[PDB]
Amino acid sequence: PGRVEIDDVAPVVSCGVYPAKAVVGEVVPVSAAVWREGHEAVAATLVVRYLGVRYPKPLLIPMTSGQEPFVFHGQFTPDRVGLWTFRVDGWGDPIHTWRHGLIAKLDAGELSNDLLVGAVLLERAATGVPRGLRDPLLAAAAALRTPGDPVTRTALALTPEIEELLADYPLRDLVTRGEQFGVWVDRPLARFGAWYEMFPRSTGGWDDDGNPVHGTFATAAAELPRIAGMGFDVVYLPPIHPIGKVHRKGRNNSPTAAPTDVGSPWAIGSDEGGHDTVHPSLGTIDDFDDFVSAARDLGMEVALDLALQCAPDHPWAREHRQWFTELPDGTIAYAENPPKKYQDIYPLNFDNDPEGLYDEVLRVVQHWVNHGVKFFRVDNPHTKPPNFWAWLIAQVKTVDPDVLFLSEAFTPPARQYGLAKLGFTQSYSYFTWRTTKWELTEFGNQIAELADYRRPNLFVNTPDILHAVLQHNGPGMFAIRAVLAATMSPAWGMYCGYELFEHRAVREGSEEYLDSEKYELRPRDFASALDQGRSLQPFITRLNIIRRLHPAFQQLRTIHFHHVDNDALLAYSKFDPATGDCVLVVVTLNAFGPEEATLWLDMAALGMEDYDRFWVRDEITGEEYQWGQANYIRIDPARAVAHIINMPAVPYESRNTLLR
Amino acid sequence: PGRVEIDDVAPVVSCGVYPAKAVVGEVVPVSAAVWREGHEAVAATLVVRYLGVRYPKPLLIPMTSGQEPFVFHGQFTPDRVGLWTFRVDGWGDPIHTWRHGLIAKLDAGELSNDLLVGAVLLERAATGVPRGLRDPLLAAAAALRTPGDPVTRTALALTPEIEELLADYPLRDLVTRGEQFGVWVDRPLARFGAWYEMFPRSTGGWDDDGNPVHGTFATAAAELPRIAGMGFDVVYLPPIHPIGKVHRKGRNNSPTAAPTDVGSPWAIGSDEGGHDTVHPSLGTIDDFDDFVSAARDLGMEVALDLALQCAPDHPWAREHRQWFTELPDGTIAYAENPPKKYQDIYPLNFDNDPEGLYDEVLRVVQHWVNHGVKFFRVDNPHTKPPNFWAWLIAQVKTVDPDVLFLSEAFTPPARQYGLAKLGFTQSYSYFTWRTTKWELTEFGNQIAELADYRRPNLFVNTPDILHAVLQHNGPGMFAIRAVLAATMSPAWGMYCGYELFEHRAVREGSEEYLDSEKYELRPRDFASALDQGRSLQPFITRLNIIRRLHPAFQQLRTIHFHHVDNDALLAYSKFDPATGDCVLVVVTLNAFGPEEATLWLDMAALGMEDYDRFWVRDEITGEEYQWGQANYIRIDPARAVAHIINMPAVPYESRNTLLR
Ligand SMILES: OC[C@H]1O[C@H](O[C@H]2[C@H](O)[C@@H](O)[C@@H](O[C@H]3[C@H](O)[C@@H](O)[C@@H](O[C@H]4[C@H](O)[C@@H](O)[C@@H](O[C@H]5[C@H](O)[C@@H](O)[C@@H](O[C@H]6[C@H](O)[C@@H](O)[C@@H](O)O[C@@H]6CO)O[C@@H]5CO)O[C@@H]4CO)O[C@@H]3CO)O[C@@H]2CO)[C@H](O)[C@@H](O)[C@@H]1O
Ligand SMILES: OC[C@H]1O[C@H](O[C@H]2[C@H](O)[C@@H](O)[C@@H](O[C@H]3[C@H](O)[C@@H](O)[C@@H](O[C@H]4[C@H](O)[C@@H](O)[C@@H](O[C@H]5[C@H](O)[C@@H](O)[C@@H](O[C@H]6[C@H](O)[C@@H](O)[C@@H](O)O[C@@H]6CO)O[C@@H]5CO)O[C@@H]4CO)O[C@@H]3CO)O[C@@H]2CO)[C@H](O)[C@@H](O)[C@@H]1O
Ligand SMILES: OC[C@H]1O[C@H](O[C@H]2[C@H](O)[C@@H](O)[C@@H](O)O[C@@H]2CO)[C@H](O)[C@@H](O)[C@@H]1O
Ligand SMILES: OC[C@H]1O[C@H](O[C@H]2[C@H](O)[C@@H](O)[C@@H](O)O[C@@H]2CO)[C@H](O)[C@@H](O)[C@@H]1O
After folding, report:
1. Domain check: are B130 and B97 in the same one?
2. Which of B590, B592, B634 to mutate to test the pocket of ligand 2 (most atoms within 8 A of CB)?
3. What residues does alpha-maltose 1-phosphate bind to (chains A, B)?
């Protein structure tokens, strides 16, 4: 009735309600506590199996004891997409009990009894191994028959052919089965990729006069190489749907729209079309299909903004009206967040006609899926029912499992981290409003930590957020945030124009871009900026190449912070369990002054003893240096705001430093 | 479905496999995280119901939001022994949504629409309240259907008359019910009581010559008043069973036993009897019944050592030999811990004849339960199968639920704390080997929050443990540990002779009492020590009185440590959620020197603002003083090694100072 106890198993999420998250080729660490009566030794074997794909022959991996007694650790690396299962099985290994006990008493060294007990072990042990190589067992099983010196037949106890033999085929006693938990593996882009947010309309390129010109998918596609050139793996496009014509918004959040103004893309829908139609000015849907294929040619993928909202002109406003929250006087209520108003849209109502709306939205998501779009940016997901997301998310991947979702949830923790739990492959974070060494240090450790179920996407900016620190610290700071986002997380992102050092907010104390891109056409000339040397495009490229270069940067779990005695300096390191690759990042939070300090290292964390000395190389500088536990470091902006340092590869003791 | 989200419920143990622990009249704090779509407000109601006894119509308590968004906290206080159940139910309260939304918009200040929506709510709400006082809502509902002032029907919202009944009877929408978890409540002695350990035989009192004399229950009962006099609630007796005559141990763990020597009581069993018989030299079983009844007259309870072990001459050795571990040569193995030998006892074998041993031991426990013994100190339980204890425990408590078990498990955490999870009402701890300011600090804080499954019993000493710090720091230290034990835990204990300052170890570097009572008979003359002023009995008495006096000391959860800028000084405070009682303890760890420092307080923890100044009284000294956030303290041993301070009672905001 449960003789051997198994508890505090990890990774488990919400006590097993939600599966943990991992990706292909990621080392997944498993741990559990196994114990039994007295001083009889115990061991556990971790059993992993890969099932179907769904969502709502065993493989055996041996587990190893560790620092803390009775807690056993293991790892496994999943090789195909779908839903995996693991469980921990616990058993008592008498051989270990017998062996360890015997070595202590042999020291006292007659006693003839314990030896025979061993002798009956290997025989019973032997039945488990096939007659073929079982023959050193009978050597051991016929090892303490006859009287003699102690080192008589222990001689077979100690040689590593039968320790190795017992390893492949073990003597298992009192086997007890553990609980089963599940892991959901996604394609690697779920963890490691870089984002670019661009407006297709802004690819217009001016007219014969000064006036901005509306772009098209065709014009948009011309800018795709340059993006790929910077190393981004995913291109994110704001909604490509028709914009409502009533209450269309003007320049600067103005209530009244000029006849030519475009209005914000998130005001989805018009007499012209719904969520399933391309806004005609961009082109026919074939042009889009053509646009996707261009990106695909460059190694990139396309992600569309998915905003479950409607403009008044949206066909649903006419076709299906049960889907909204209707006021008492027959008017239809504008989407609302008190007392501020976003007048150009309608909130959906998920309670009046649930299976009605559910099936239609699924149809729509499926539409774009059929057109090569396999990454969606769910918009303001926290203002829609959770169970819906749990359903919609689970529903799409089961027919096709390579579709991934990103949650734009700027919301308090319980909701933000909560949403991740229900299936979102990625989530936005509070990253932008973390700017002090202490916010960032705890934040870095925080990310993650939550890796078993949350993978964060760190965005340096979004059309709605230009943090104050970018406003007054000048072009230097833009580098700093880029270094932080790119290094802290495998997944990071950027909004267009960031590369131009766009740092002007509409008015002081606001976080909205002046002459915001949501309401106006803004073609930009990146090439000229490059020529006059006022673009951060080369640097970002160098940042993006480096992450791809070092697989250490694709890890969530292994971030570790090292001590630097300067409030303005931040130093942390990441490593890869697989290749042993190891990297240390040192950045300044001060854009303005040269800063110097003494850097102290936790050598154990890098896999070396404290007195060691080793050589490092700076991937930006190319400089090589000799280092030890304590090293001198000085950072000078207007030369380089950060040092990305390559460190000696962590020995094949990588696996235990990943533990927990 | 679940339409509304419920997560991170606490207190839950091992994801619900094991019930949490609590006792009667203890405030049990419950917390959970509840959230839903958008800015619509949400609330939760905690539903508690009391089930039967067993082990392996509703009452409703409203839950309140707090500092951290979306996490709701609640409490309930169980009033009868048995198994309780609780679950969290989640719902959306539209009024709150409507109310909070309207107040923000009212400042903008026509609005003609929102008011009717409220008005259709309050009416929909009226359906929930029972014919009679239902009506001012309809009054509130029809006071703006009429056009008018904005402030006109806010009138009917404004009034504290309308926050009302709705708290008592609420309008609940989209109600979703949470998972169910269980709590097992024991009698209060499970948490709060003090222990005294005595050898019945040591109550012998010499003969006409100098020679010590073996005692009896009769003689043992003579020492019971003085024990009660010191305030102890439980008397713990080493096994009272017959001691084996074969391989019986001599003075000082000597291998050979003299003819008169008594042997260790844990060497259970002889030709005279087994576990079901009283050792005859102590008396007839009636004498025991008389002794137990005697203690109960004094307000005490009797606790017997439950040691699953056998001497060679034990009846089981012949009667049932399947129950033992028989060697290959037919001998049966002596108790063993490699390479140490415990020649006087036999380990049991729980695998050969499981239902065989299970059934005898349960019978044995029931024998003594029938004789008024409802507390057992299970001996070295970690050297017996886990599942067994889980079985034995659930089996005993269902017939009689007032039987409680204490686990002497000096074992690594996973096992020690693990064992507590299975049902052990109390557990021994690592307390004796914590002697530095940081260790005691960590240990005290550590007590919590494991309160949900572990209640620690802090023993200053046992026959097996005479700590080094006691060895050289003189009688002063003995006070210090007593203060630490009594204050840190609601439940604490003492082994006989401690009060006489017995401080001599067998050899330097050992933790065993010289001329140990386990192997030798040791009568003591407590009275003479009193006259000659070398007894810590008065002080201990004052300590136990103080504990009973302040109910704050019966709490596990609320211990909090305050900063004192001295490495030799330790200051912590406890309070009682019920009466608001609050107490602060300051103790010194150096027995030899006067020590002084500046004591800093976190007033918020004590329920006061930082600037407040207030009056306190020292329960040992008796005089009143005035204090503030920072106060001067100096401690002089050889007058008093600690200050136990009565502090201003925590206001009726105790409950919120308890969250999580
Ligand atoms: O060439 C690179 C550089 O060029 C441009 O800067 C030029 C600039 O136009 C010119 O006027 C001049 O500027 C002065 C500057 O006005 C002075 O204020 C002086 O800055 C010092 C400053 O007054 C100090 O307060 C000091 O504060 C530091 C902190 O010590 C740091 O901790 C850090 O604060 C961070 C903080 O730790 C966090 O907790 C969080 O709050 O976030 C903060 C990040 O801002 O940084 C602040 C401010 O840096 O720092 C300075 C001294 O250490 O410096 C100039 C006097 O020479 O200098 C430039 C001409 O060479 C362009 O604006 C820059 O973007 C570009 O990087
Ligand atoms: O009369 C009442 C009094 O009588 C007895 O004590 C007398 C004692 O027999 C007598 O010898 C004398 O004591 C002397 C002592 O011999 C000297 O050694 C000296 O003691 C100082 C000591 O050398 C210092 O190292 C200093 O150490 C403190 C630490 O500062 C504390 O941090 C603390 O250490 C704890 C530590 O923090 C933890 O990490 C952990 O390791 O546990 C430690 C606790 O053991 O305690 C030690 C010492 O307690 O403390 C002394 C500085 O004054 O000077 C002494 C006299 O100046 O004095 C006594 C009477 O004459 C009887 O044993 C006492 O119980 C009784 O109160
Ligand atoms: O849809 C028009 C509206 O867009 C923005 O408002 C939302 C929108 O859902 C997303 O862009 C997302 O970022 O959140 C925004 C704020 O909740 C604009 O902020 C707003 O000016 C515009 O009317
Ligand atoms: O049980 C008697 C036997 O062991 C003793 O030690 C005991 C101790 O008394 C108990 O607390 C029990 O739980 O386990 C201990 C074993 O380490 C004596 O130390 C020993 O001499 C005696 O033979």
Report:
1. yes
2. B592
3. 249, 309, 344, 380, 518-519
